[PDB]
């Protein structure tokens, strides 16, 4: 059992966190979650959960990793081991997350190999996959609305090849399956420690995606009709806030895009030095993450407003109200750039870079927690080459279910339920509750002061005590007292077995906490008042 390594430099933490949760949850998912919830109304619970629960739980898992130099699961051995099932819940969340996140990267890669033509296949619709109800978007205001855009038909009929529902999975798309396998080879050969441990990361991870996001923002803001998209993006419809879809979507988009019910930020904090001020670095990285989401949302919603101006249809109905929105709006914007082939290549390499670095961080966090769970069973040698390949192989094979002919329906089920549903509220509420009330805000603030150097302020104290538990419990209860079923793109109603499977994914994430509580109360000898007292005592 070798001693646990640290980062060996201060900037290795920041690059592994900037590459950690600045990814597709900012540039791909905050877009359609904002779009699906009316745009303006999404930002109010977004910033409420950001400034009451996002940066709080972000600093919370980072400093839990820094305090207890352990990743994900075994970090709770000194943070009330009775709730050690928060770590197992986090690993279930991050496993299902790795599956569907890498499916997004497979779609981006399929677009990338379809970007090298002189004419982009979504730029026009005289192809084999296009319905006869299509023409160019520039011609949609001159013909007499049951007419469909070339980018939308490309997305649903050559990339997705979208089927009638989750009841009809269709055939496995061999193109997308090979794309998914190539991206998993890229991931496996980067968790193989040969790549990403270089000095050229900073000019290829923190430099080029933000430059490409700046170029996309410049292109989207100068489009005609971008002001209507910005008004859709910013101006809140208050009546939507009385519905729990917007609160759940915004709160779990905070908890998703901060990667913060996953054990991965706990894992990244576990390589921090003890006496190392993680707090200011966490604030800078959280500002980077939320600013990336906000700026890329400005970009993509300006593009959506341009599309609504050009096609003559309303903003909320111009593209997909579901997981494909970054694959309609951003390719459509790229077709409006000079030399759109080169910008298609750069944009899908940008998505690949963001999503790949994020995937390396979450996959490495899952692996870090699972080798902290079993040291000397998974050493730094040959067993962490076979376990790595096994984790990648089952995540790829279970990702084949979501990349078939009807794989968007399974993907939207995974996205809404498996790693960003009430499971994120569950794990975040229980993290804040265990800290604040079984471990103590005062005792944990003393722990923080021993290494950070100062007392965390009343914001962190009252967020871990009151604000994050109240927000998570309120959205959890309010999503059930006013329950609406998951729908894909406002028109597909899911069958009850599919909603049950999504709830099963959520509960497989959720129920790791009470089942570990039951197992630990059953494996410890004594009465209940002695068992609970022993299992809440840190080790």
């Amino acid at each position, epitope marked *: 059992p070798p001693q646990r390594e640290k980062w060996s430099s201060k900037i290795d933490f920041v690059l592994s966190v900037a590459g950690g949760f600045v990814g597709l949850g900012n540039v791909w998912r905050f877009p359609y979650l904002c779009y699906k919830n009316g745009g303006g109304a999404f930002l109010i619970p977004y910033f409420i959960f950001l400034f009451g629960s996002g940066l709080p739980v972000f600093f919370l898992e980072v400093i839990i990793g820094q305090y207890t130099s352990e990743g994900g699961i075994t970090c709770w051995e000194k943070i009330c081991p009775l709730f050690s099932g928060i770590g197992y819940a986090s690993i279930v969340i991050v496993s299902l997350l790795n599956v569907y996140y890498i499916v997004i990267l497979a779609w981006a890669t399929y677009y990338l190999f379809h970007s090298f033509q002189k004419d982009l296949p979504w730029a026009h619709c005289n192809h084999s996959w296009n319905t006869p109800q299509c023409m160019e978007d520039t011609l949609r205001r001159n013909e007499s609305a049951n007419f469909t855009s070339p980018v939308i038909e490309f997305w649903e009929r050559n990339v997705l090849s979208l089927s009638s529902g989750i009841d009809n999975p269709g055939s496995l798309k061999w193109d997308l399956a090979l794309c998914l396998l190539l991206v998993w080879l890229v991931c496996f050969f980067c968790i193989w420690k040969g790549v990403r441990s270089t000095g050229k990361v900073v000019y290829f991870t923190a430099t080029f995606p933000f430059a490409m996001l700046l170029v996309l923002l410049v292109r989207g803001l100068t489009l005609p009709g971008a002001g209507e998209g910005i008004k859709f993006y910013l101006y809140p419809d208050i009546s939507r806030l009385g519905d729990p879809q917007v609160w759940i979507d915004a709160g779990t988009q905070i908890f998703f895009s901060y990667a913060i019910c996953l054990g991965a930020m706990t894992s990244l904090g576990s390589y921090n030095k003890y*006496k190392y001020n993680s707090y200011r670095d966490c604030m800078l990285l959280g500002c980077l993450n939320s600013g990336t989401s906000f700026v890329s949302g400005f970009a993509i919603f300006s593009i959506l407003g341009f599309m609504a101006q050009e096609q003559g249809v309303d903003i909320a109905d111009v593209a997909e109200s579901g997981p494909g929105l970054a694959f309609i709006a951003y390719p459509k914007a790229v077709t409006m750039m000079p030399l759109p082939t080169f910008w298609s290549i750069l944009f899908f390499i940008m998505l690949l870079l963001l999503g790949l670095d994020s995937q390396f961080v979450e996959v490495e966090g899952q692996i870090t927690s699972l080798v902290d769970l079993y040291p000397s069973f998974l050493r730094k040698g040959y067993r962490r080459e076979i376990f790595i390949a096994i984790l990648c192989s089952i995540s790829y094979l279970l990702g084949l279910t979501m990349v078939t002919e009807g794989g968007m329906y399974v993907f939207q089920l995974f996205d809404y339920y498996a790693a960003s549903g009430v499971c994120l509220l569950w794990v975040a509420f229980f993290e804040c509750f265990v800290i604040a009330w079984i471990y103590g805000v005062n005792r944990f603030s*003393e722990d923080i*002061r021993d290494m950070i150097g*100062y*007392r965390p302020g009343p914001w962190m104290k009252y967020s871990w005590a009151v604000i994050t538990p109240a927000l998570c419990v309120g959205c959890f209860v309010f999503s059930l007292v006013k329950y609406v079923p998951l729908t894909y793109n406002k028109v597909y109603r899911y069958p009850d077995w599919a909603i049950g499977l999504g709830w099963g994914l959520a509960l497989s994430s959720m129920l790791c906490i009470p089942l570990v509580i039951v197992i630990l109360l059953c494996r410890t000898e004594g009465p209940l008042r002695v068992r609970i007292k022993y299992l809440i005592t840190p080790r």
Partner: antibody, heavy 118, light 108 residues
Framework: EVQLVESGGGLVKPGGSLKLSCAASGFTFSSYAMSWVRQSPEKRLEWVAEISSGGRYIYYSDTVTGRFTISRDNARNILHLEMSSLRSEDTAMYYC????????????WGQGTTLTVS | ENVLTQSPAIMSTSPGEKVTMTCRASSSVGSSYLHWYQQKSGASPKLWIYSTSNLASGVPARFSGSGSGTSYSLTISSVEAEDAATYYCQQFSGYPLTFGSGTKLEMK
């Protein structure tokens, strides 16, 4: 008004024992780490012992790392420093210092207890 | 220990003249962790400059601090008659906390 009043300093024999009592007032004593800093008659400030807010993290200098014990009484708001095996080079001017934020230092000091060893 | 070798204790300057005093540390202090304390004649020390630049409450703006890593400085723009005191630098990062030597400012 943050007030730190120390007491219990006097003349002790070499190898003896003494207990100081920094009585804290005007602030929530359980929320700040407190230190004992001693000043030699040559006026060279030396940090002795730091205790955290709850007493879980306790630090000592190398000169007193095995014979000094710092403790708090958070209910009545008194900081303590119990000494043993008081050697000749412990004659000093003992201050309790409210050092909790490490990027701010000992922002409030107390008065002094003249510990003399002879 | 992190020994802070500070400027020699006996320095004597006329009032109203800009003075400076240095504080060299054996190890590398993170420059948000070395603080300056002013102790008068027969009084307790009090915090003067913290995180080597910020001025504590009741410290005049004519005091200033500078430096990082190893060399740290206390600077007075114009010494008034109330500056006759001893100034101690003190890293407050490494858990064996150490003060500097004395630097006594005296008049003419």
């Amino acid at each position: 008004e943050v007030q730190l009043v120390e007491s219990g300093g006097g003349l002790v024999k070499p190898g003896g024992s003494l207990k100081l009592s920094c009585a804290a007032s005007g602030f929530t004593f359980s929320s700040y780490a407190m230190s004992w800093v001693r000043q030699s008659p040559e006026k060279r400030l030396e940090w002795v012992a730091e205790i955290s807010s709850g007493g879980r993290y306790i630090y000592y200098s190398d000169t007193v790392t095995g014979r000094f014990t710092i403790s708090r009484d958070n209910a009545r708001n008194i900081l303590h420093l119990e000494m043993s095996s008081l050697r000749s080079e412990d004659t000093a001017m003992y201050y309790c210092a409210r050092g909790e934020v490490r990027q701010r230092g000992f922002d409030y000091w107390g008065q002094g207890t003249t510990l003399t060893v002879s | 220990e992190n020994v802070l070798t500070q400027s020699p204790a006996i320095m004597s300057t006329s009032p109203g003249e800009k003075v400076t005093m240095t504080c060299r540390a054996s190890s590398s202090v993170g420059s948000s962790y070395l603080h300056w304390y002013q102790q008068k004649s027969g009084a307790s020390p009090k915090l003067w400059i913290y995180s080597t630049s910020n001025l504590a409450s009741g410290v005049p703006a004519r005091f200033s601090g500078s430096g990082s890593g190893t060399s740290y400085s206390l600077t007075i723009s114009s010494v008034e008659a109330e500056d006759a005191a001893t100034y101690y630098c003190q890293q407050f990062s490494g858990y064996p906390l150490t003060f500097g030597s004395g630097t006594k400012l005296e008049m003419k």
